[PDB]
Short mmCIF file of C-alpha atoms and ligand atoms in Angstrom, two decimals:
data_model
loop_
_atom_site.label_atom_id
_atom_site.label_comp_id
_atom_site.label_asym_id
_atom_site.label_seq_id
_atom_site.Cartn_x
_atom_site.Cartn_y
_atom_site.Cartn_z
CA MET D 1 196.34 37.26 89.05
CA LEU D 2 198.73 39.94 89.40
CA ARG D 3 196.80 42.37 91.58
CA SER D 4 195.96 39.76 94.23
CA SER D 5 199.83 39.32 94.33
CA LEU D 6 199.97 42.81 95.91
CA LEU D 7 197.55 42.23 98.69
CA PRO D 8 200.11 41.43 101.22
CA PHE D 9 201.50 44.95 100.70
CA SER D 10 198.00 46.38 101.09
CA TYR D 11 197.43 44.74 104.44
CA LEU D 12 200.76 45.91 105.74
CA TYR D 13 200.06 49.51 104.27
CA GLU D 14 196.75 49.38 106.16
CA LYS D 15 198.49 48.97 109.51
CA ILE D 16 200.83 51.83 108.73
CA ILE D 17 197.91 53.95 107.57
CA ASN D 18 195.75 53.18 110.49
CA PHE D 19 198.45 53.82 113.19
CA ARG D 20 199.04 57.30 111.80
CA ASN D 21 195.45 58.09 111.57
CA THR D 22 195.03 56.75 115.16
CA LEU D 23 197.66 59.05 116.29
CA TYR D 24 195.91 62.01 114.66
CA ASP D 25 192.56 60.98 116.10
CA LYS D 26 193.72 60.69 119.72
CA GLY D 27 195.89 63.83 119.79
CA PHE D 28 199.22 62.46 119.51
CA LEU D 29 200.41 64.43 116.66
CA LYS D 30 200.16 68.13 116.38
CA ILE D 31 197.49 69.73 114.29
CA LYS D 32 198.33 73.37 113.24
CA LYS D 33 195.89 76.26 112.98
CA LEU D 34 196.16 79.00 110.36
CA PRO D 35 194.44 82.28 111.49
CA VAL D 36 192.09 82.43 108.65
CA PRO D 37 189.54 79.83 107.45
CA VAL D 38 190.64 76.76 105.69
CA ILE D 39 188.55 74.55 103.38
CA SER D 40 190.08 71.01 102.40
CA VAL D 41 189.10 69.44 99.03
CA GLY D 42 190.29 65.74 99.12
CA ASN D 43 189.77 62.18 97.97
CA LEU D 44 190.45 58.76 99.05
CA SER D 45 191.98 57.72 95.76
CA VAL D 46 195.28 58.03 93.96
CA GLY D 47 193.21 58.33 90.75
CA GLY D 48 191.28 61.52 89.81
CA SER D 49 187.87 62.20 91.60
CA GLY D 50 186.93 65.46 89.78
CA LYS D 51 189.03 67.72 92.11
CA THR D 52 190.04 70.49 89.62
CA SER D 53 186.40 70.83 88.75
CA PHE D 54 185.23 71.08 92.39
CA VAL D 55 188.00 73.54 93.14
CA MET D 56 186.78 75.71 90.31
CA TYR D 57 183.24 75.53 91.63
CA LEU D 58 184.38 76.30 95.15
CA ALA D 59 186.37 79.36 94.02
CA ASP D 60 183.45 80.66 92.26
CA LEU D 61 181.29 80.37 95.40
CA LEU D 62 184.12 82.26 97.08
CA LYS D 63 184.27 84.90 94.35
CA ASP D 64 183.65 87.69 96.93
CA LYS D 65 186.80 86.71 99.07
CA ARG D 66 190.41 86.84 98.51
CA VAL D 67 191.22 83.22 97.74
CA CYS D 68 194.49 81.31 97.88
CA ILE D 69 195.06 77.64 96.92
CA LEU D 70 197.38 75.74 98.89
CA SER D 71 198.73 72.92 96.65
CA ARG D 72 201.44 70.13 97.20
CA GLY D 73 203.17 70.89 94.03
CA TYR D 74 204.34 67.37 94.32
CA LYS D 75 206.05 66.84 90.97
CA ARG D 76 208.39 69.84 90.99
CA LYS D 77 212.06 69.40 90.91
CA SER D 78 212.38 72.71 92.97
CA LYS D 79 211.23 72.73 96.49
CA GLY D 80 210.41 74.93 99.44
CA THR D 81 207.45 77.17 99.65
CA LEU D 82 206.75 78.97 96.29
CA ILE D 83 204.15 81.53 95.24
CA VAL D 84 202.89 80.18 91.91
CA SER D 85 200.20 82.89 91.31
CA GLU D 86 199.09 86.19 92.79
CA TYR D 87 195.50 86.55 92.07
CA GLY D 88 195.69 85.46 88.73
CA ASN D 89 199.25 86.65 87.83
CA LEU D 90 201.53 83.82 87.22
CA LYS D 91 204.97 84.43 88.90
CA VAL D 92 206.72 81.22 87.54
CA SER D 93 206.49 79.03 84.49
CA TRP D 94 204.95 75.78 84.53
CA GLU D 95 208.37 73.76 84.56
CA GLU D 96 209.00 75.48 87.93
CA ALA D 97 205.48 75.33 89.25
CA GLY D 98 204.84 71.85 88.36
CA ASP D 99 201.92 71.13 85.83
CA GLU D 100 199.09 70.86 88.25
CA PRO D 101 199.40 74.06 90.40
CA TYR D 102 200.15 75.93 87.25
CA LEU D 103 197.05 74.62 85.49
CA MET D 104 195.00 75.63 88.57
CA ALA D 105 196.33 78.98 88.40
CA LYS D 106 195.25 79.25 84.75
CA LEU D 107 191.88 77.74 85.31
CA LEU D 108 191.29 80.34 88.21
CA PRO D 109 192.67 84.00 87.21
CA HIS D 110 191.12 85.47 90.42
CA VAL D 111 192.73 83.34 92.98
CA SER D 112 196.35 82.93 94.19
CA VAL D 113 198.12 79.61 94.23
CA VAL D 114 200.93 78.58 96.61
CA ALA D 115 202.96 75.28 96.11
CA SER D 116 204.35 73.65 99.36
CA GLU D 117 204.49 70.27 100.72
CA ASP D 118 203.86 71.54 104.09
CA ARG D 119 200.64 73.43 103.69
CA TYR D 120 200.76 75.37 106.81
CA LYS D 121 204.08 76.92 105.85
CA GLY D 122 202.42 77.85 102.54
CA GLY D 123 199.68 79.65 104.19
CA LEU D 124 202.12 81.61 106.37
CA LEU D 125 203.94 82.76 103.22
CA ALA D 126 200.62 83.61 101.61
CA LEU D 127 199.41 85.45 104.74
CA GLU D 128 202.71 87.64 104.64
CA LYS D 129 202.68 88.40 101.05
CA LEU D 130 199.24 88.06 99.62
CA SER D 131 196.72 88.71 102.56
CA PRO D 132 194.21 86.09 101.50
CA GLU D 133 190.81 85.67 103.37
CA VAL D 134 190.40 82.07 102.82
CA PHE D 135 192.50 78.93 101.91
CA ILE D 136 191.55 76.02 99.77
CA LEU D 137 193.56 72.88 99.97
CA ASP D 138 193.05 71.31 96.63
CA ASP D 139 194.34 67.78 97.82
CA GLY D 140 194.29 67.95 101.64
CA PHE D 141 192.39 65.11 102.97
CA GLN D 142 195.19 63.20 104.33
CA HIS D 143 197.46 66.34 105.29
CA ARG D 144 196.04 66.24 108.96
CA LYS D 145 198.89 68.41 110.14
CA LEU D 146 196.76 71.27 109.00
CA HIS D 147 193.66 72.01 110.57
CA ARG D 148 190.71 72.59 108.10
CA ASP D 149 187.43 74.15 109.22
CA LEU D 150 185.43 72.40 106.39
CA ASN D 151 186.59 69.02 105.31
CA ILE D 152 185.21 68.19 102.02
CA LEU D 153 185.67 64.72 100.51
CA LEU D 154 185.17 63.74 96.81
CA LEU D 155 183.82 60.29 96.21
CA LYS D 156 183.18 58.47 93.08
CA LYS D 157 181.32 55.20 92.86
CA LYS D 158 184.46 53.50 92.03
CA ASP D 159 186.04 54.29 95.18
CA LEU D 160 183.46 52.36 96.97
CA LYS D 161 184.43 49.12 95.42
CA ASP D 162 188.23 49.64 95.60
CA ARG D 163 190.96 48.30 97.81
CA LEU D 164 194.03 49.98 99.39
CA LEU D 165 197.22 50.68 97.45
CA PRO D 166 199.04 49.08 95.93
CA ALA D 167 196.50 46.18 95.15
CA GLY D 168 193.79 48.87 94.66
CA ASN D 169 193.77 52.61 94.11
CA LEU D 170 192.75 53.77 97.88
CA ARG D 171 195.22 55.88 99.93
CA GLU D 172 193.03 55.19 102.92
CA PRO D 173 190.39 52.65 104.02
CA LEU D 174 186.82 53.56 103.37
CA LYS D 175 186.15 53.91 106.98
CA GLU D 176 188.10 57.34 106.91
CA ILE D 177 184.99 58.77 105.18
CA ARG D 178 184.08 59.61 108.77
CA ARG D 179 186.66 62.56 108.82
CA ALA D 180 184.53 64.44 106.17
CA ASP D 181 182.08 67.25 107.01
CA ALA D 182 180.58 67.03 103.63
CA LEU D 183 180.68 64.48 100.60
CA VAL D 184 180.68 65.52 96.92
CA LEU D 185 179.57 62.68 94.78
CA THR D 186 181.50 62.75 91.55
CA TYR D 187 181.86 61.17 88.17
CA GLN D 188 178.09 61.34 87.91
CA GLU D 189 178.12 61.97 84.12
CA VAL D 190 179.71 58.46 83.29
CA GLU D 191 178.96 56.51 86.64
CA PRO D 192 176.00 58.11 88.36
CA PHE D 193 175.38 56.90 91.90
CA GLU D 194 173.82 57.79 95.43
CA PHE D 195 175.49 57.21 98.77
CA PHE D 196 173.81 58.06 102.13
CA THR D 197 175.99 58.60 105.34
CA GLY D 198 173.93 61.17 107.19
CA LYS D 199 176.64 63.67 106.11
CA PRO D 200 175.74 66.50 104.06
CA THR D 201 176.13 65.20 100.54
CA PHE D 202 176.07 66.80 96.93
CA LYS D 203 176.19 65.49 93.41
CA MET D 204 178.73 67.24 91.21
CA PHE D 205 177.94 67.63 87.36
CA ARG D 206 180.00 69.28 84.46
CA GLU D 207 178.27 70.74 81.47
CA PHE D 208 180.10 71.89 78.18
CA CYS D 209 180.27 75.76 78.17
CA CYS D 210 182.96 77.08 75.79
CA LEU D 211 186.51 76.72 74.32
CA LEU D 212 189.50 78.05 76.27
CA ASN D 213 192.17 79.64 74.08
CA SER D 214 195.84 79.48 74.68
CA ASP D 215 195.81 82.43 77.00
CA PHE D 216 192.94 80.47 78.84
CA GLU D 217 190.21 83.04 78.12
CA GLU D 218 186.86 81.95 77.42
CA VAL D 219 185.86 81.86 73.73
CA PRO D 220 182.61 80.81 72.01
CA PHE D 221 182.16 77.22 70.99
CA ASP D 222 180.81 78.83 67.56
CA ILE D 223 184.18 79.02 65.98
CA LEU D 224 184.19 75.26 65.25
CA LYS D 225 180.94 75.55 63.19
CA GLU D 226 181.63 74.04 59.73
CA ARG D 227 185.37 73.46 60.59
CA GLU D 228 187.18 70.05 61.25
CA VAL D 229 189.69 70.23 64.05
CA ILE D 230 192.80 68.36 64.59
CA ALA D 231 192.71 66.88 68.23
CA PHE D 232 195.65 65.70 70.39
CA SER D 233 196.58 64.84 73.83
CA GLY D 234 199.05 62.67 76.04
CA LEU D 235 198.74 58.96 75.81
CA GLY D 236 196.56 58.13 78.63
CA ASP D 237 194.11 60.92 78.09
CA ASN D 238 193.56 59.73 74.35
CA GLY D 239 190.57 57.63 75.76
CA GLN D 240 188.64 60.20 77.75
CA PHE D 241 189.30 63.06 75.31
CA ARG D 242 188.31 61.04 72.22
CA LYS D 243 184.87 59.84 73.78
CA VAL D 244 184.17 63.45 74.88
CA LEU D 245 184.94 65.15 71.60
CA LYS D 246 182.65 62.56 69.87
CA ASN D 247 179.50 62.93 72.39
CA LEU D 248 179.95 66.68 71.99
CA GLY D 249 179.53 66.37 68.17
CA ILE D 250 182.93 67.97 67.51
CA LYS D 251 184.17 66.94 64.00
CA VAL D 252 187.86 65.59 64.34
CA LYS D 253 189.61 65.02 61.13
CA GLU D 254 192.68 63.61 62.81
CA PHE D 255 193.63 62.61 66.21
CA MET D 256 197.22 62.56 67.58
CA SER D 257 198.48 60.64 70.57
CA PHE D 258 201.71 61.97 72.30
CA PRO D 259 203.67 60.48 75.32
CA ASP D 260 202.24 61.50 78.77
CA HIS D 261 205.52 63.14 79.51
CA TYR D 262 205.61 65.68 76.72
CA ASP D 263 206.84 69.24 77.09
CA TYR D 264 205.85 69.97 73.46
CA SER D 265 209.18 71.13 72.74
CA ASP D 266 209.04 69.78 69.21
CA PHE D 267 205.38 70.67 68.42
CA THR D 268 204.74 72.35 65.35
CA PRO D 269 201.22 73.22 64.36
CA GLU D 270 200.01 74.31 61.10
CA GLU D 271 198.96 77.77 60.37
CA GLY D 272 195.27 77.95 59.58
CA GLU D 273 194.30 74.71 61.23
CA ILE D 274 192.33 74.66 64.43
CA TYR D 275 193.50 72.25 67.06
CA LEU D 276 191.69 70.96 70.36
CA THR D 277 193.65 69.66 73.31
CA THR D 278 193.42 69.07 77.12
CA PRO D 279 193.92 71.86 79.52
CA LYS D 280 196.96 69.98 80.86
CA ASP D 281 198.47 69.99 77.37
CA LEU D 282 197.29 73.57 76.57
CA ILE D 283 199.50 75.10 79.36
CA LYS D 284 202.67 74.13 77.40
CA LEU D 285 201.47 75.78 74.23
CA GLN D 286 200.50 79.43 75.18
CA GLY D 287 201.08 81.81 72.20
CA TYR D 288 199.70 79.33 69.75
CA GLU D 289 196.48 81.18 68.98
CA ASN D 290 194.96 78.20 66.92
CA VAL D 291 195.05 75.71 69.92
CA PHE D 292 192.03 75.44 72.21
CA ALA D 293 190.81 73.18 75.10
CA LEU D 294 187.21 72.46 76.17
CA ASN D 295 185.83 74.38 79.21
CA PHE D 296 183.05 72.90 81.39
CA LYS D 297 180.69 74.68 83.94
CA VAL D 298 180.89 72.97 87.30
CA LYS D 299 177.36 72.50 89.16
CA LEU D 300 176.19 71.00 92.42
CA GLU D 301 172.88 69.79 93.06
CA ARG D 302 170.94 71.29 96.04
CA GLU D 303 173.99 73.33 96.91
CA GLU D 304 172.50 75.59 99.53
CA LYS D 305 173.57 73.61 102.62
CA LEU D 306 177.08 73.54 101.12
CA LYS D 307 177.02 77.38 101.05
CA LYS D 308 175.67 77.55 104.56
CA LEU D 309 178.57 75.62 105.89
CA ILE D 310 181.05 77.72 104.00
CA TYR D 311 179.37 80.83 105.27
CA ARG D 312 179.64 79.85 108.88
CA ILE D 313 183.42 79.23 108.83
CA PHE D 314 183.92 83.02 108.66
CA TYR D 315 183.16 83.41 112.40
N1 ATP S 401 185.38 72.25 84.51
C1 ATP S 401 186.36 72.03 83.78
N2 ATP S 401 186.70 72.72 82.58
C2 ATP S 401 187.74 72.44 81.95
N3 ATP S 401 188.59 71.54 82.28
C3 ATP S 401 188.48 70.90 83.49
C4 ATP S 401 187.50 70.98 84.16
N4 ATP S 401 187.48 70.28 85.39
C5 ATP S 401 188.82 69.67 85.17
N5 ATP S 401 189.36 69.99 83.90
C6 ATP S 401 190.58 69.45 83.34
O1 ATP S 401 190.24 68.29 82.60
C7 ATP S 401 190.88 67.16 83.26
C8 ATP S 401 189.80 66.05 83.47
O2 ATP S 401 188.74 66.21 84.37
P1 ATP S 401 188.03 65.06 85.33
O3 ATP S 401 187.36 65.76 86.60
O4 ATP S 401 187.37 64.11 84.45
O5 ATP S 401 189.47 64.17 85.80
P2 ATP S 401 190.05 63.99 86.94
O6 ATP S 401 191.40 63.28 86.67
O7 ATP S 401 189.16 63.22 87.96
O8 ATP S 401 190.42 65.41 87.54
P3 ATP S 401 191.73 65.90 88.24
O9 ATP S 401 192.86 65.98 87.29
O10 ATP S 401 191.30 67.30 88.77
O11 ATP S 401 192.00 64.85 89.52
C9 ATP S 401 191.30 67.53 84.73
O12 ATP S 401 192.49 66.75 84.96
C10 ATP S 401 191.64 69.03 84.42
O13 ATP S 401 192.88 69.21 83.82
#
């Protein structure tokens, strides 16, 4: 009965969140405008809702534009505004960038990535140094201080039954779905679901494509043919990763579980063996040419309307 014990904090947190949102709604707090288009990707949950996949998909749609991701870079022990990546060129290590913005830069070698708590300041720096044509906020639904021309909200079925922090995982009450210009329905593979709001709505799917090597280049799945791999990941990821490796038919001779906080500073792989791990782990192991991650293609069902919305923000 522990969870219900946190409900009083949830109701309190609701008042705090609703007040802030009301101030934004009614024009009491400033909303700043960058002089090029801004697309926000977001979610209502503190848990994952497929954002990295959707940013990959979104960047691919925008492959003919100069793209810059504006990330919070929340973890990082350093602060201020920081260029992590210039169109694929990493400017800092993962330690300094934080895991997540560094990983996004590796997953998207054609886009820039800027880490900045204040997204607007991030954009200004990018404008001066990188001359991008469009910004993507990878987690910007609540960052209402920055105007976005297209507000995309990711929603998984589980969100619809959740409750506010700290009793549940929601950062905001479900009514705030109203702020979205478009919904992307995620986690379809494990929990398929429909949701009608009248808003433009798109189901997202992932499909296995290839391995990623330690340099994050795409390499064929073929190399696993008649090989048994050693797989490893952080403590929590162990579950999802295992299930996925099995359903893909990947032969695993041994699995290893490390703590979620591992910098792999003591990791010693065996020459001649092939390793599979998560992209979040892979970033700490570049150079090891026998360590790979799985790469998935990202697709949106009936995407045409989404493309139209994106097209129209460049006027
Ligand atoms: N299309 C993809 N190909 C390869 N790796 C991916 C892809 N999309 C995401 N990843 C990596 O795999 C992890 C799991 O993906 P998934 O979307 O199931 O989890 P999530 O926690 O909802 O995602 P996120 O970390 O973006 O919030 C992500 O955290 C990211 O590191």
